[PDB]
mmCIF file of C-alpha atoms and ligand atoms in Angstrom:
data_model
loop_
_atom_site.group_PDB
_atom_site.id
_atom_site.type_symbol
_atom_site.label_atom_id
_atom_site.label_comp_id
_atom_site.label_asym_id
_atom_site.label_seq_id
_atom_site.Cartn_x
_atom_site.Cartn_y
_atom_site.Cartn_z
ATOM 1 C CA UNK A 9 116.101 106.357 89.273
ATOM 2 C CA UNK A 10 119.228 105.789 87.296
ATOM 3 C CA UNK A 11 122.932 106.681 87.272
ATOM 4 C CA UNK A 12 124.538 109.370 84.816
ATOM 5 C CA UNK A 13 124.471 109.249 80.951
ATOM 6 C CA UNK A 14 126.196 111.628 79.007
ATOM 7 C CA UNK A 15 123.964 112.550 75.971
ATOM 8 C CA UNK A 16 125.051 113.319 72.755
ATOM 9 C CA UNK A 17 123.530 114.951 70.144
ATOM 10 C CA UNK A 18 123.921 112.366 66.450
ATOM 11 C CA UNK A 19 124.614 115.618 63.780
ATOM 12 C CA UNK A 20 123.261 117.922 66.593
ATOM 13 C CA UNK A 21 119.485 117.703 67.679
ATOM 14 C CA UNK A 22 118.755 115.919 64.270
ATOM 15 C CA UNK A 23 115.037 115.172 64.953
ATOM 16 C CA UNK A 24 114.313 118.866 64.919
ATOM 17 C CA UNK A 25 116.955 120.791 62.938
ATOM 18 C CA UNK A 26 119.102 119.494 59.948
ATOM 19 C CA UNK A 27 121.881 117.665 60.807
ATOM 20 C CA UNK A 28 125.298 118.839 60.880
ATOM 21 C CA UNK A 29 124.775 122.401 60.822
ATOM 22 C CA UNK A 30 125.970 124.869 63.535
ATOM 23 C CA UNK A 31 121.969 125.633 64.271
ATOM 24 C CA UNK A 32 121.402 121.843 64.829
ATOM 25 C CA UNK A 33 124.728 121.406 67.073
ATOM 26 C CA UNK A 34 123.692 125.110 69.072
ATOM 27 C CA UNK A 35 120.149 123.465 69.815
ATOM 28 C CA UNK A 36 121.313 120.337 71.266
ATOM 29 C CA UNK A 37 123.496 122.089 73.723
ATOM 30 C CA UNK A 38 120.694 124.501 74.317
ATOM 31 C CA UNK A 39 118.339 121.234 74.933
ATOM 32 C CA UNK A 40 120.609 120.161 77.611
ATOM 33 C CA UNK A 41 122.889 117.836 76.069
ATOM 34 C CA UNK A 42 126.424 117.209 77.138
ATOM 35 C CA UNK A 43 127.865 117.599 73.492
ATOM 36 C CA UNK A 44 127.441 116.715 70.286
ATOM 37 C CA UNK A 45 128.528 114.004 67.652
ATOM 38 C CA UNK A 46 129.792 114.913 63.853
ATOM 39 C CA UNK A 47 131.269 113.631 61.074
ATOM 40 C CA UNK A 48 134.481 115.396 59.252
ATOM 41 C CA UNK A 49 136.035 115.128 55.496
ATOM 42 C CA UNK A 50 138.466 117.715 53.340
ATOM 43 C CA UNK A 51 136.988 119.953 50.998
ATOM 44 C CA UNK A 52 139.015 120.187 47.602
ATOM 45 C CA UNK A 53 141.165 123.088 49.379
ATOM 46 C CA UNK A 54 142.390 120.718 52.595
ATOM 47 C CA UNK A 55 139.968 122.138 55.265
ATOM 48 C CA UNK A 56 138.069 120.539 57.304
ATOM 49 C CA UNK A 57 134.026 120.292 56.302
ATOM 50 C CA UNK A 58 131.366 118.982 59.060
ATOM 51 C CA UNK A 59 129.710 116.164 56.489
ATOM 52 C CA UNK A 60 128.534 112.653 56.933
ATOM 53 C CA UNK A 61 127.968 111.692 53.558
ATOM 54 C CA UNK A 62 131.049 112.313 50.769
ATOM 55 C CA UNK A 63 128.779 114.528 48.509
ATOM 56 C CA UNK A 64 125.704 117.088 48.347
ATOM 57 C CA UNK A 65 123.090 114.396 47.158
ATOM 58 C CA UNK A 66 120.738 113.271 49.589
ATOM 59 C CA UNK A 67 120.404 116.536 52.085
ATOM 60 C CA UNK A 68 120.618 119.512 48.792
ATOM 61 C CA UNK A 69 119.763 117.248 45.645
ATOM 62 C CA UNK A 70 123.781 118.541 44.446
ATOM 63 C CA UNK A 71 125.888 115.703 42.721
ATOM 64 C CA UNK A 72 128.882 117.604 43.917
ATOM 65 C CA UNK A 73 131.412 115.764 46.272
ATOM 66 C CA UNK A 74 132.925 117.741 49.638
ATOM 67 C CA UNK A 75 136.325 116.923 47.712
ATOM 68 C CA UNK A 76 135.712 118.355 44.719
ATOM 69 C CA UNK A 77 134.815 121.800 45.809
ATOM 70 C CA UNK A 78 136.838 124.766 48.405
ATOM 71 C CA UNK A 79 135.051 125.367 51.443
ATOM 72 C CA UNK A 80 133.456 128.658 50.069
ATOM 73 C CA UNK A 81 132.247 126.672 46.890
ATOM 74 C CA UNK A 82 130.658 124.184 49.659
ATOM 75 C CA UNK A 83 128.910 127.211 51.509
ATOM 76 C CA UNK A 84 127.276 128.654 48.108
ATOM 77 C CA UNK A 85 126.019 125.604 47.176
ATOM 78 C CA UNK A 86 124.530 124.845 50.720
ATOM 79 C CA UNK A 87 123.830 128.724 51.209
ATOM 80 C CA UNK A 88 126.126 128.629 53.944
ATOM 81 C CA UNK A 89 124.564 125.631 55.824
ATOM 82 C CA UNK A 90 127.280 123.580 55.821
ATOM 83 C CA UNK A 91 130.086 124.478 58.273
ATOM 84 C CA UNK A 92 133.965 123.204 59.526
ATOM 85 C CA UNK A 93 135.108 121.813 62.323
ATOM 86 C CA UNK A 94 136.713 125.461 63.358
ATOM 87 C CA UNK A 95 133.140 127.217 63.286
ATOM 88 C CA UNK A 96 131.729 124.458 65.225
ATOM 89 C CA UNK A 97 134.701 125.431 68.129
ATOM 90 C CA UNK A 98 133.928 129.229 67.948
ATOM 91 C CA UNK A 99 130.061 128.135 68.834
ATOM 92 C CA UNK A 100 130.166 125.562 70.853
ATOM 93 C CA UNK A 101 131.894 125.956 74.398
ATOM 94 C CA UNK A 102 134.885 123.794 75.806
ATOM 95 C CA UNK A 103 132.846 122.692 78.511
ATOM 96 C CA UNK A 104 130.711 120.406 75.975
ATOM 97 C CA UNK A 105 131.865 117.188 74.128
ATOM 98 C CA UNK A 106 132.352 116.622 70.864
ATOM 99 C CA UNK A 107 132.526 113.263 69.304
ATOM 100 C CA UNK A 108 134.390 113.853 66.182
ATOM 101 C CA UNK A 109 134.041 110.890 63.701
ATOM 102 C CA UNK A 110 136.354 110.712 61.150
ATOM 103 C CA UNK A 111 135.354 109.835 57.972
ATOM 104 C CA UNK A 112 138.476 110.353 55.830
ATOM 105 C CA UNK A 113 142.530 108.689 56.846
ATOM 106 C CA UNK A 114 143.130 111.705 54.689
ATOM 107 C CA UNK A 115 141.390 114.581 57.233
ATOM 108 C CA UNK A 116 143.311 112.985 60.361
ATOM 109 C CA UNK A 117 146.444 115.277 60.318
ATOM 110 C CA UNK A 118 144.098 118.283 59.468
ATOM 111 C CA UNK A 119 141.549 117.476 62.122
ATOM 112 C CA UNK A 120 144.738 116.895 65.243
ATOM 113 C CA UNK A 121 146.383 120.376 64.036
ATOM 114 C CA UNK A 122 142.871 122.282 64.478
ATOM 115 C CA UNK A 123 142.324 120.141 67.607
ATOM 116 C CA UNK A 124 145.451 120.975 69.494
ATOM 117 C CA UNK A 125 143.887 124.415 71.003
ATOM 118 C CA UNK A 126 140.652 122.664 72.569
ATOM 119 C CA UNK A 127 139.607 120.281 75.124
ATOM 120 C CA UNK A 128 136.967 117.711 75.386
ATOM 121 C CA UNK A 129 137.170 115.908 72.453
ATOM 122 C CA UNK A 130 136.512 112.595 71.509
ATOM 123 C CA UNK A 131 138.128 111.195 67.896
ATOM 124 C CA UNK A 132 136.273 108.076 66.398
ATOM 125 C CA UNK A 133 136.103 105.877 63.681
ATOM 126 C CA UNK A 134 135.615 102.492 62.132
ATOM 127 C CA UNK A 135 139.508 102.443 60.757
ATOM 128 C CA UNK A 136 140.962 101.320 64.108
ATOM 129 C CA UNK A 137 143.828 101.072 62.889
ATOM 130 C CA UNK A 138 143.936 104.719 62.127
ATOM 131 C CA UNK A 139 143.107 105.491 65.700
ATOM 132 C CA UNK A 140 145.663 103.335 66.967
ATOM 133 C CA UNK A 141 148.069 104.633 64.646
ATOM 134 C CA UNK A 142 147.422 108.270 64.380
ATOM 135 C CA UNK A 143 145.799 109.467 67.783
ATOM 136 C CA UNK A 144 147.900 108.228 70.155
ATOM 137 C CA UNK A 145 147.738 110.705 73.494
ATOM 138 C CA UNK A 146 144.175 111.771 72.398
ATOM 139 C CA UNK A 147 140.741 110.415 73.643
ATOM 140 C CA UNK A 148 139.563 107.904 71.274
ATOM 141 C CA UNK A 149 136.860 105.520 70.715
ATOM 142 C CA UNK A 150 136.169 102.627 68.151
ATOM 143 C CA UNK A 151 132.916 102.470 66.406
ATOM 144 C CA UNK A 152 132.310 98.700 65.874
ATOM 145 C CA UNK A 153 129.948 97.711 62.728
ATOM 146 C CA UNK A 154 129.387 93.723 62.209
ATOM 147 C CA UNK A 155 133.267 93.026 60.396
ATOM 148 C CA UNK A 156 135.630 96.014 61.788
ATOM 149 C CA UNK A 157 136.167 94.282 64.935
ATOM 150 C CA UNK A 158 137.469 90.724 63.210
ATOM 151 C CA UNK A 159 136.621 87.903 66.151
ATOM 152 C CA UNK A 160 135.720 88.978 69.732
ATOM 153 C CA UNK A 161 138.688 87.601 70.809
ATOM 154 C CA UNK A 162 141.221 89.850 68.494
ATOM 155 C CA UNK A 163 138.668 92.832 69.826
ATOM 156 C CA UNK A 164 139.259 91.682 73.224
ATOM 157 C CA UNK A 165 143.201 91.634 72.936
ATOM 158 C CA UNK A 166 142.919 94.928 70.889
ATOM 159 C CA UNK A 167 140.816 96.687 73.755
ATOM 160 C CA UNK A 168 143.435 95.615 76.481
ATOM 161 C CA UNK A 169 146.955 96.356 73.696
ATOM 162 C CA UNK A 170 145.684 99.673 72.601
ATOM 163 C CA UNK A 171 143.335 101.088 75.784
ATOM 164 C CA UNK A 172 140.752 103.328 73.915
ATOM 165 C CA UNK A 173 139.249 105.956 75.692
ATOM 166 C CA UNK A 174 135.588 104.631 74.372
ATOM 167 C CA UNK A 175 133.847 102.121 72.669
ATOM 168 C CA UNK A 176 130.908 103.396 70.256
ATOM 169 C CA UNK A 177 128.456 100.034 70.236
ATOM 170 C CA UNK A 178 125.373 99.898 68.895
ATOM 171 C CA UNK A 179 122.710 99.342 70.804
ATOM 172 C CA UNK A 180 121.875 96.049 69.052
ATOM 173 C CA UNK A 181 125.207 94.689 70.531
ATOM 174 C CA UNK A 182 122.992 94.335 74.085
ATOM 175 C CA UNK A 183 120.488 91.209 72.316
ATOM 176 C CA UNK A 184 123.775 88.821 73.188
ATOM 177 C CA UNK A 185 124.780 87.922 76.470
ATOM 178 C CA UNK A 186 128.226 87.097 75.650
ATOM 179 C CA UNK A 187 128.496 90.560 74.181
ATOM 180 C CA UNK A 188 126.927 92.008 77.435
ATOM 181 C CA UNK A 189 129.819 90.492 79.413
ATOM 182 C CA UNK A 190 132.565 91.395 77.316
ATOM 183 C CA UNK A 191 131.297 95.455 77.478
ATOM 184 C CA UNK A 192 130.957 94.726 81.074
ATOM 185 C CA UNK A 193 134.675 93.627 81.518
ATOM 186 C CA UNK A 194 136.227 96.626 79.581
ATOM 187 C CA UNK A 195 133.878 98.769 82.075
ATOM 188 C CA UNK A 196 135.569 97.476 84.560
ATOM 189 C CA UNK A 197 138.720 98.535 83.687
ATOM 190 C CA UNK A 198 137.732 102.443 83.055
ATOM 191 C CA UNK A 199 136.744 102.106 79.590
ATOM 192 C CA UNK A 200 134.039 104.507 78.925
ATOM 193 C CA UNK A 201 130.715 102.521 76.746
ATOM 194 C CA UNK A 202 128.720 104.842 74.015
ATOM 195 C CA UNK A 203 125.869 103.122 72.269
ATOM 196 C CA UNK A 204 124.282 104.731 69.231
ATOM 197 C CA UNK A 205 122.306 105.502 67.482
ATOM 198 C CA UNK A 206 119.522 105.114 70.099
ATOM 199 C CA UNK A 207 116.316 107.021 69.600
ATOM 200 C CA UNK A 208 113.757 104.288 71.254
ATOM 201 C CA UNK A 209 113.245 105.066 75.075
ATOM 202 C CA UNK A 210 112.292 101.686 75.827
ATOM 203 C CA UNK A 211 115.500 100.184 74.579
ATOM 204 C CA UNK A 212 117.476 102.779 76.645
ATOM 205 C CA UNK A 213 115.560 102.164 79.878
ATOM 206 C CA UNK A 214 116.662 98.142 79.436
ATOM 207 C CA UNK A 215 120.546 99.609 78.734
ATOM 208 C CA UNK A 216 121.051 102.008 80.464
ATOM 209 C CA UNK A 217 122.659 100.677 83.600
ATOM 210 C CA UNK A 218 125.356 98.916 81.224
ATOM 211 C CA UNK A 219 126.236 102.143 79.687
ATOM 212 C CA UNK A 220 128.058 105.715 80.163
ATOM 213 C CA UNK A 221 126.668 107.687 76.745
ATOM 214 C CA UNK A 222 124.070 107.277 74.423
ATOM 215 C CA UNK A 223 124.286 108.914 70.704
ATOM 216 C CA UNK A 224 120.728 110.004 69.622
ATOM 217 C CA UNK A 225 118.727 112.394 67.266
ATOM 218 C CA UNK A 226 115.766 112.693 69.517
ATOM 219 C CA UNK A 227 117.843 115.482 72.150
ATOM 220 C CA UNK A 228 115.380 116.211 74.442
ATOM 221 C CA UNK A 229 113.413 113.014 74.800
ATOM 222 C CA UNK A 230 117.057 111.789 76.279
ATOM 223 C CA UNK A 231 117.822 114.651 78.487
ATOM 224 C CA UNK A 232 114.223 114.679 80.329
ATOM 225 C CA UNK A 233 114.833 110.508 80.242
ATOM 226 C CA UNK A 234 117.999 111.075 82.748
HETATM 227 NA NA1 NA B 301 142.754 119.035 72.179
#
């Protein structure tokens, strides 16, 4: 028996539906998860577009970037799989998260107008700077990769200058004791700990009592795992 992990769907239930589309967000919620996690960049005509990668390539075989084309260009190319941040809203209820990664400075002003209207959000991103800079009075996390973070002591003094809602860890991070007590001291203080992106029950079961969230493809296998 273990305490409460919010579970977020990584692109939606990912395992089972393709990733990033309003069917794959819609079945993660339906699964029993407490949200979902996406990734957002501007289409050519400044709207927002749900899309990890910057171009068509590796999920439609189309060497067309999300830049380069208007959202209605996007959705004939993708035969209307791809969506925006606003359709995911109109389908996905308030009383679910969603983890909104941002993958472009550029989409930050865009992405803060839209969300404005709508509760439980989460903004995050490996520019920290941006965060710190731009989403100010917002929930916000930083996703840490093996350089963004600079020394653990500059991520330390960043944690306690800035206060982020979250931090977004992978689940590698737990192999180091060191690292084990520094995520322990900012839980401490209220900070809310989101590992990703975890699909291996066995790794979550060792985790889990260090952790408030997990990030994973493989929806219900996490839900039924609570
Ligand atoms: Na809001």
């Amino acid at each position: 028996h273990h305490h409460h992990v919010i579970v977020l769907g990584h692109r939606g239930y990912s395992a089972k539906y393709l990733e990033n589309t309003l069917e794959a967000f819609m079945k993660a919620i339906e699964a029993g998860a407490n949200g979902v996690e996406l990734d957002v960049r501007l289409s050519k005509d400044g709207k927002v577009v749900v899309s990890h990668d910057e171009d068509l390539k590796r999920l439609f075989g189309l060497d067309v970037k999300i830049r380069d084309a208007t959202v209605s260009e996007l959705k004939e190319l993708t035969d209307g799989k791809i969506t925006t941040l606003k359709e995911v809203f109109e389908n996905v209820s308030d009383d679910k998260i969603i983890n909104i990664e941002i993958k472009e400075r550029e989409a930050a002003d865009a992405v803060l107008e839209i969300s404005k209207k709508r509760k439980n959000l989460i903004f995050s991103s490996f520019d920290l700077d941006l965060l710190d800079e731009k989403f100010k009075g917002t929930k916000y996390g930083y996703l840490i990769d093996e350089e963004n973070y600079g020394s653990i002591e500059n991520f330390v003094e960043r944690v306690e200058k800035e206060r982020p809602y979250s931090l977004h860890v992978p689940y590698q991070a737990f192999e180091l004791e060191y690292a084990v007590e520094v995520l322990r001291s900012f839980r401490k203080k209220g900070i809310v700990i989101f590992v990703w992106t975890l699909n291996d029950p066995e790794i979550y079961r060792k985790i889990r009592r260090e952790i408030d969230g997990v990030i994973t493809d493989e929806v219900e296998l996490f839900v039924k795992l609570r």
